[PDB]
């Protein structure tokens, strides 16, 4: 991750940045047996540094490494910055299953169009989408995310702490089918304005039917489902588009999001 410059270096080529010895860099990936792609801590610029000038300092899983990149590169308490850091690392360093910047354009439009006062995310992972949505909630508005994996939950918590969004989000530890019935009970929710679906692709139908059967859906509650089409959510995308209880709308960027506005029982 963290490297230091051993020698001063003026930029030659078209793709490299300049630096003084002692400047730190956080490394995105190598290229040849030389060249790294990196971010200057001094200027936040991304570019190529030659391996002859640079060496590792001492800064396990992909998930701590995304979190570590954010804490080195992004401005804390600035959600836009954190999103750009995760985007940057997951573009050039390591693929990760966050909804990207692309599908995140869609969510921004849906979140903005429908001003939810209360959102349920199913699948936090590294906290990318939680930040993406919570940065757009009106003051007072709440986000609730559900994450099985306690490991993914621990990272999501730090990622929110870093973004400054911890105060308007609440991670819930467990599987969906465990937690969804607990919702009105244990976390005083009446109905849900919006639900985001990016957890395991098969559970998109139990949980939908469960939430319905739990009353948490109201007329007008918006269901947004990631990874229809790619991976593939085939019985969800059939249940919902043929049920009179949902008006569906499809969006691309070819993967896509399905908007499913609940029209009632
Ligand atoms: N049934 C379930 N209940 C709660 N969390 C689940 C779940 N099935 C899968 N998950 C979690 O959902 C995550 C899916 S990856 C989702 C990425 C995230 N929505 C983003 O865009 O940034 C994984 O971390 C997995 O642990
Ligand atoms: K995916």
Curated annotation (Swiss-Prot):
<keyword id="KW-0808">Transferase</keyword>
<dbReference type="GO" id="GO:0016036">
    <property type="term" value="P:cellular response to phosphate starvation"/>
</dbReference>
<dbReference type="GO" id="GO:0001666">
    <property type="term" value="P:response to hypoxia"/>
</dbReference>
<dbReference type="GO" id="GO:0042417">
    <property type="term" value="P:dopamine metabolic process"/>
</dbReference>
<dbReference type="GO" id="GO:0060840">
    <property type="term" value="P:artery development"/>
</dbReference>
<keyword id="KW-0963">Cytoplasm</keyword>
<feature type="binding site">
    <location>
        <position position="147"/>
    </location>
    <ligand>
        <name>S-adenosyl-L-methionine</name>
    </ligand>
</feature>
<dbReference type="GO" id="GO:0034097">
    <property type="term" value="P:response to cytokine"/>
</dbReference>
<feature type="binding site">
    <location>
        <position position="198"/>
    </location>
    <ligand>
        <name>S-adenosyl-L-methionine</name>
    </ligand>
</feature>
<dbReference type="GO" id="GO:0001822">
    <property type="term" value="P:kidney development"/>
</dbReference>
<dbReference type="GO" id="GO:0042596">
    <property type="term" value="P:fear response"/>
</dbReference>
<dbReference type="GO" id="GO:0097205">
    <property type="term" value="P:renal filtration"/>
</dbReference>
<dbReference type="GO" id="GO:0006950">
    <property type="term" value="P:response to stress"/>
</dbReference>
<dbReference type="GO" id="GO:0001964">
    <property type="term" value="P:startle response"/>
</dbReference>
<dbReference type="GO" id="GO:0009410">
    <property type="term" value="P:response to xenobiotic stimulus"/>
</dbReference>
<dbReference type="GO" id="GO:0016020">
    <property type="term" value="C:membrane"/>
</dbReference>
<keyword id="KW-0597">Phosphoprotein</keyword>
<dbReference type="GO" id="GO:0009266">
    <property type="term" value="P:response to temperature stimulus"/>
</dbReference>
<dbReference type="GO" id="GO:0035640">
    <property type="term" value="P:exploration behavior"/>
</dbReference>
<dbReference type="GO" id="GO:0048265">
    <property type="term" value="P:response to pain"/>
</dbReference>
<dbReference type="GO" id="GO:0042415">
    <property type="term" value="P:norepinephrine metabolic process"/>
</dbReference>
<feature type="binding site">
    <location>
        <position position="226"/>
    </location>
    <ligand>
        <name>Mg(2+)</name>
    </ligand>
</feature>
<dbReference type="GO" id="GO:0097018">
    <property type="term" value="P:renal albumin absorption"/>
</dbReference>
<dbReference type="GO" id="GO:0033344">
    <property type="term" value="P:cholesterol efflux"/>
</dbReference>
<dbReference type="GO" id="GO:0045211">
    <property type="term" value="C:postsynaptic membrane"/>
</dbReference>
<dbReference type="GO" id="GO:0016206">
    <property type="term" value="F:catechol O-methyltransferase activity"/>
</dbReference>
<keyword id="KW-0812">Transmembrane</keyword>
<feature type="binding site">
    <location>
        <position position="176"/>
    </location>
    <ligand>
        <name>S-adenosyl-L-methionine</name>
    </ligand>
</feature>
<dbReference type="GO" id="GO:0050965">
    <property type="term" value="P:detection of temperature stimulus involved in sensory perception of pain"/>
</dbReference>
<keyword id="KW-1133">Transmembrane helix</keyword>
<dbReference type="GO" id="GO:0045963">
    <property type="term" value="P:negative regulation of dopamine metabolic process"/>
</dbReference>
<dbReference type="GO" id="GO:0021696">
    <property type="term" value="P:cerebellar cortex morphogenesis"/>
</dbReference>
<dbReference type="GO" id="GO:0043197">
    <property type="term" value="C:dendritic spine"/>
</dbReference>
<keyword id="KW-0460">Magnesium</keyword>
<dbReference type="GO" id="GO:0002001">
    <property type="term" value="P:renin secretion into blood stream"/>
</dbReference>
<dbReference type="GO" id="GO:0007611">
    <property type="term" value="P:learning or memory"/>
</dbReference>
<keyword id="KW-0472">Membrane</keyword>
<dbReference type="GO" id="GO:0050890">
    <property type="term" value="P:cognition"/>
</dbReference>
<dbReference type="GO" id="GO:0032496">
    <property type="term" value="P:response to lipopolysaccharide"/>
</dbReference>
<keyword id="KW-0531">Neurotransmitter degradation</keyword>
<dbReference type="GO" id="GO:0042424">
    <property type="term" value="P:catecholamine catabolic process"/>
</dbReference>
<feature type="binding site">
    <location>
        <position position="227"/>
    </location>
    <ligand>
        <name>substrate</name>
    </ligand>
</feature>
């Amino acid at each position: 991750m963290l490297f230091v410059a051993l020698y001063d270096y003026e930029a030659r080529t078209e793709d490299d940045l300049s630096f003084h010895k002692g400047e730190k860099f956080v490394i995105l990936r190598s290229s040849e047996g030389d060249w790294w792609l990196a971010v200057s801590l001094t200027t936040g610029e991304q570019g190529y540094i030659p391996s002859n000038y640079v060496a590792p300092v001492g800064g396990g899983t992909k998930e701590q490494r995304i979190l570590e990149f954010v804490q080195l590169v992004a401005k804390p308490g600035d959600p836009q910055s954190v999103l750009e850091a995760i985007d940057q690392y997951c573009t050039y360093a390591e693929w990760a299953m966050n909804v990207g910047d692309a599908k995140g354009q869609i969510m921004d439009a849906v979140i903005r169009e429908y001003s939810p006062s209360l959102v349920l995310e199913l699948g936090a992972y590294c906290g990318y989408s939680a930040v993406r949505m919570a940065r757009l909630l009106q003051p007072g508005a709440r986000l609730l995310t559900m994450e099985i994996n306690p490991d993914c939950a621990a990272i999501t918590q730090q990622m929110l702490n870093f973004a400054g969004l911890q105060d308007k989000v609440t991670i819930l530890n467990g599987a969906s089918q465990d937690l969804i019935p607990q919702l009105k009970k244990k976390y005083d929710v009446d109905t849900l304005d919006m639900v985001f679906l990016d957890h395991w692709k098969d559970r998109y139908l139990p949980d939908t039917l469960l939430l319905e059967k739990c009353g948490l859906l109201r007329k007008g509650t918006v269901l947004l489902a990631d990874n229809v089409i790619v991976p593939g959510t085939p019985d969800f995308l059939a249940y919902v588009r043929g049920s009179s209880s949902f008006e569906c709308t499809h969006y691309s960027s070819v993967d896509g999001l399905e908007k499913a506005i609940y029209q009632g029982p």
